[PDB]
Amino acid sequence: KRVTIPRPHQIRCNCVECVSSSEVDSLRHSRSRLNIYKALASPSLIALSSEDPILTAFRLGWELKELSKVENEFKAEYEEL
Amino acid sequence: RDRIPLQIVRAETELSAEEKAFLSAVEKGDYATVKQALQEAEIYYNVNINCMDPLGRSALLIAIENENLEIMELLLNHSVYVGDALLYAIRKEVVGAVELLLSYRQFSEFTPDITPIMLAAHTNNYEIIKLLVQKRVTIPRPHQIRCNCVECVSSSEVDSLRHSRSRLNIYKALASPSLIALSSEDPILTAFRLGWELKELSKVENEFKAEYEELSQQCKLFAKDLLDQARSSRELEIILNHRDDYHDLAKLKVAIKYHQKEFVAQPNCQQLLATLWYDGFPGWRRK
Amino acid sequence: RDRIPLQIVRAETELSAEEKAFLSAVEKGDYATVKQALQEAEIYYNVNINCMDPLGRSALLIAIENEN
Amino acid sequence: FDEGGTLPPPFNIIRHADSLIQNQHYQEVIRNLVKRYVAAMIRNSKTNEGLTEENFKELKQDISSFRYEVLDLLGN
Amino acid sequence: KTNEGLTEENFKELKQDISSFRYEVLDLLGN
Numbered sequence: 001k002r003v004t005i006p007r008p009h010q011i012r013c014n015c016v017e018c019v020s021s022s023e024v025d026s027l028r029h030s031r032s033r034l035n036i037y038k039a040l041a042s043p044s045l046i047a048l049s050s051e052d053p054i055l056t057a058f059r060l061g062w063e064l065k066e067l068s069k070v071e072n073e074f075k076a077e078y079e080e081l
Numbered sequence: 082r083d084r085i086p087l088q089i090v091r092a093e094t095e096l097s098a099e100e101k102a103f104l105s106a107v108e109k110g111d112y113a114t115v116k117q118a119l120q121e122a123e124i125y126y127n128v129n130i131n132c133m134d135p136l137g138r139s140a141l142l143i144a145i146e147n148e149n150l151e152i153m154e155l156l157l158n159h160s161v162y163v164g165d166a167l168l169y170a171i172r173k174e175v176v177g178a179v180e181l182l183l184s185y186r187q188f189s190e191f192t193p194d195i196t197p198i199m200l201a202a203h204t205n206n207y208e209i210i211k212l213l214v215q216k217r218v219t220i221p222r223p224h225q226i227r228c229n230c231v232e233c234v235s236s237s238e239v240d241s242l243r244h245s246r247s248r249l250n251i252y253k254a255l256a257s258p259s260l261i262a263l264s265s266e267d268p269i270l271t272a273f274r275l276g277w278e279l280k281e282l283s284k285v286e287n288e289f290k291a292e293y294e295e296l297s298q299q300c301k302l303f304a305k306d307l308l309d310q311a312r313s314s315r316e317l318e319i320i321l322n323h324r325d326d327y328h329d330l331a332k333l334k335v336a337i338k339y340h341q342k343e344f345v346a347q348p349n350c351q352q353l354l355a356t357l358w359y360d361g362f363p364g365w366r367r368k
Numbered sequence: 369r370d371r372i373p374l375q376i377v378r379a380e381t382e383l384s385a386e387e388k389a390f391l392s393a394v395e396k397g398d399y400a401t402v403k404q405a406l407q408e409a410e411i412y413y414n415v416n417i418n419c420m421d422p423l424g425r426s427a428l429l430i431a432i433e434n435e436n
Numbered sequence: 437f438d439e440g441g442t443l444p445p446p447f448n449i450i451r452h453a454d455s456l457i458q459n460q461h462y463q464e465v466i467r468n469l470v471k472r473y474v475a476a477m478i479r480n481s482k483t484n485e486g487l488t489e490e491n492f493k494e495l496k497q498d499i500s501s502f503r504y505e506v507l508d509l510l511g512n
Numbered sequence: 513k514t515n516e517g518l519t520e521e522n523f524k525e526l527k528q529d530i531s532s533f534r535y536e537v538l539d540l541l542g543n
């Protein structure tokens with residue numbers, strides 16, 4: 001059946017949405033990104049819905065480590081993912 | 082004489098075979114046999130229903146460890162001797178037998194001071210405690226340290242090994258998470274004032290140092306877990322700014338005067354502060 | 369005054385006994401009893417099938433954890 | 437954090453309703469937190485506990501009683 | 513009673529109990 005998953009913005013994005021919501025509720029905005037990144041990194045989904053399952057684990061296990069330096073609160077989580 | 086004889090030096094009584102088959106039938110689930118033996122023992126008199134197996138187990142304590150709620154009622158409609166049978170059903174956490182025993186209202190494993198409300202708090206059930214507090218109960222109050230009344234000095238010299246156990250029992254009863262979350266008005270400020278005076282007691286009583294020290298640790302994780310269950314920012318702002326009896330952090334300063342190192346080293350509390358130490362510099366994401 | 373009283377400070381609602389036996393029969397597997405109680409509750413009105421046990425579990429969340 | 441206006445060393449020589457509404461607001465958060473904590477702690481026990489010898493006996497007794505009652509009904 | 517684990521011996525007794533129950537019930541009912 002037809003489903004869909006949202007798309008997270010790039011780091012240091014500076015749109016009006018990323019700066020307005022990040023100052024009205026700052027504890028709820030920092031949880032959806034972690035949930036999405038935990039959803040996107042599962043082995044079964046990558047082996048089921050990717051065109052090249054080897055080159056998609058190289059470009060995604062490299063930009064989960066840069067995120068481990070700007071977000072000091074969830075260092076262990078991002079590191080383990 | 083190069084052999085060693087063997088014999089029993091401390092003898093006790095033995096039972097008869099007629100009695101034996103009764104307890105043997107209770108242990109297997111036969112319901113049509115025991116119901117007969119209960120009936121012939123009212124016209125003729127050959128068996129007593131209050132016997133005891135070699136290990137001190139009677140006919141009512143075997144049907145509790147095997148959870149059978151259909152033989153208990155059958156033994157209870159007949160007049161049997163119910164002694165300390167309510168303390169054996171709270172140690173083994175079952176719910177139906179508890180009620181059932183409540184409704185039909187010289188050897189043991191428990192000291193002569195244990196009460197049901199105190200034994201149900203050593204274990205950590207939430208459903209059993211709520212059934213005993215709807216009825217009226219009470220727990221004693223311990224005196225302050227270095228108290229000097231006539232009672233504290235007279236009893237402490239007639240029996241000094243029994244007087245040092247009730248205080249430990251009471252302090253183990255008072256420090257359970259469920260009771261604090263069920264019967265307190267402020268569940269956060271009562272774990273600060275109680276996890277601080279269980280450590281002073283660890284210096285005057287050299288015998289139970291480890292016990293008191295470990296009891297002081299169950300009161301430091303409760304507050305942290307209760308705090309990290311939040312789902313928004315307004316809830317954090319309301320909690321950390323509560324003053325009993327303006328808008329400054331009037332509850333994060335009381336946690337520093339008590340040396341609580343896990344309540345002030347949490348991601349949320351360390352992210353609320355970083356937005357006030359960098360006021361005037363909207364972005365620190367630079368080279 | 370050397371005693372400490374105890375009471376509940378945050379009260380909630382309680383259920384009735386008639387309802388109690390319904391949820392008690394759902395937890396044991398009785399299929400011929402619950403099918404009757406579902407039927408008398410359509411001519412007479414004495415039980416609501418959307419009750420909740422003390423722990424927030426309804427009549428449909430008990431039959432999921434026991435795979436029936 | 438406090439307003440002291442501390443200059444560097446050299447230049448250093450020259451009523452009911454509010455309480456009621458706060459106490460009314462403070463309780464619902466506590467109630468919800470207690471609910472969630474109790475639920476989580478009850479759930480956590482279901483998954484991380486092993487088995488022992490006590491359960492084998494109850495299973496055996498159940499089978500035994502079932503057999504005995506069925507035999508009693510069928511035989512007579 | 514509290515600090516002992518399970519092993520393979522108990523599974524066999526349970527299986528044998530079920531088997532004997534089934535056999536005796538089938539013997540009575542069938543004939």
Ligand SMILES: [Zn+2]
Pocket residue numbers: 009013018
């Ligand atoms: Zn963003």
Ligand SMILES: [Zn+2]
Pocket residue numbers: 224228233
């Ligand atoms: Zn004293």
